[PDB]
Amino acid sequence: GAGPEMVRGQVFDVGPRYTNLSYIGEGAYGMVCSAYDNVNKVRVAIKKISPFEHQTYCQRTLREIKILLRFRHENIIGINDIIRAPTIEQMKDVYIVQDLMETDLYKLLKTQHLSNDHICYFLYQILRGLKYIHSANVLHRDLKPSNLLLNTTCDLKICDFGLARVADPDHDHTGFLTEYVATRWYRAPEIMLNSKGYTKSIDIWSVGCILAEMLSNRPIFPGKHYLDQLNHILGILGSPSQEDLNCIINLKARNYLLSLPHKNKVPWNRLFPNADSKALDLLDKMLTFNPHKRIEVEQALAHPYLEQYYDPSDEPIAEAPFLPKEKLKELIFEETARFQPG
């Protein structure tokens, strides 16, 4: 009737509820598979996770499980089930069950031209999700096409909250070239200059990047290393204004910008000659150099580009806003307890 099922030589032990395994790929670190859920009669995605040797992998797993279990939103991936051993001592892996999403925006962009209607709809859903996340005082901090899941009807769901943090603007300041975790091509200019990525404006930049990418099927700022990323940004936006430089008090950061040759803005309509003009107006506002001047999520939603979808009453906000590895394991154990046969 059952056993410890294997997939590509590794235990993928999810039964008896989940049968007929097919492999998909790799996760952050751990195997991903689809499987037939025998209770709700649908195929699902199951991600195997093995974090307990390392406090960082515990921190990200716990952080993401805590977040995804607290969140309930149509445009954020839910956790349907969590499979693990009944005791801390026997728990070496955890399996997270999610709705099966056929594709993601990375894969889609590599293979499919998007109509303006698709771009508009996808951007609406990204921002609708992001409204909820930000309303919970959470920063996602790693928005990118591969973290935007899509099913067969183009329902879009934000995933991968492993690098998320509670917002903390009063402690956002840092020095020049401070090391950063999140994906390079979607990093706001200030990450390289004077920001730890603790304000909401960090996510809007990433959304701006994703919009630009949907318009042309190519990343807009494909930097090859930490500081090339900034010079990609400045080659399009042009040199920051005196006013925007006066906001950067750090001398290494400011003097770096002052050392560069003057660059003029590349107009959006020459970079994207087939783009809708309202899309380019909103792109410009999301890809603003100065984070204090950058559009906020709610303002983005209310922009004329999204007028066909905008409905604030149907764009919900969160009811409930918000260490050694041994204690993180116990907290992962406690956090996943609600899915245990009971």
Side-chain angles (χ1 to χ4, degrees), residues 280-314:
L280 297 184
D281 187 75
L282 179 51
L283 182 59
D284 182 63
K285 294 173 164 52
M286 290 189 291
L287 292 186
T288 290
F289 178 84
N290 185 346
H292 303 97
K293 289 176 185 171
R294 202 171 296 154
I295 199 168
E296 287 213 335
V297 61
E298 287 160 282
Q299 290 172 300
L301 287 160
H303 186 276
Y305 185 54
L306 295 179
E307 228 80 83
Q308 292 161 312
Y309 292 102
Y310 182 49
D311 180 0
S313 74
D314 188 31

Side-chain angles (χ1 to χ4, degrees), residues 121-246:
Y121 185 43
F122 291 174
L123 182 67
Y124 176 70
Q125 292 184 83
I126 294 161
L127 288 163
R128 184 169 177 261
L130 192 66
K131 178 192 178 176
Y132 181 93
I133 297 172
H134 285 183
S135 73
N137 208 33
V138 174
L139 311 176
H140 183 286
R141 301 170 74 250
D142 196 23
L143 295 169
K144 63 181 160 170
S146 58
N147 290 339
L148 301 182
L149 307 185
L150 293 108
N151 69 5
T152 306
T153 43
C154 301
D155 294 325
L156 179 153
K157 299 197 190 277
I158 299 161
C159 73
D160 238 296
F161 291 79
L163 300 180
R165 298 276 188 283
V166 169
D168 189 10
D170 305 330
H171 301 243
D172 190 65
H173 203 270
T174 194
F176 178 52
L177 309 175
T178 296
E179 298 284 25
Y180 204 64
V181 292
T183 313
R184 192 193 298 113
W185 295 344
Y186 304 92
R187 287 176 196 163
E190 60 278 18
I191 295 302
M192 286 72 79
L193 293 165
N194 66 355
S195 175
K196 299 202 276 192
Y198 289 177
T199 70
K200 289 166 180 187
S201 58
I202 208 73
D203 286 331
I204 292 304
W205 182 269
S206 300
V207 180
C209 287
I210 291 157
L211 177 52
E213 196 164 341
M214 287 195 285
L215 292 166
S216 69
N217 298 81
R218 314 177 90 173
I220 184 169
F221 303 130
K224 291 184 177 72
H225 52 259
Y226 185 98
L227 195 54
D228 192 37
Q229 191 55 38
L230 181 59
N231 315 322
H232 268 274
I233 301 158
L234 301 180
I236 300 311
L237 268 49
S239 303
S241 71
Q242 180 59 256
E243 179 165 290
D244 289 353
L245 288 172
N246 293 163

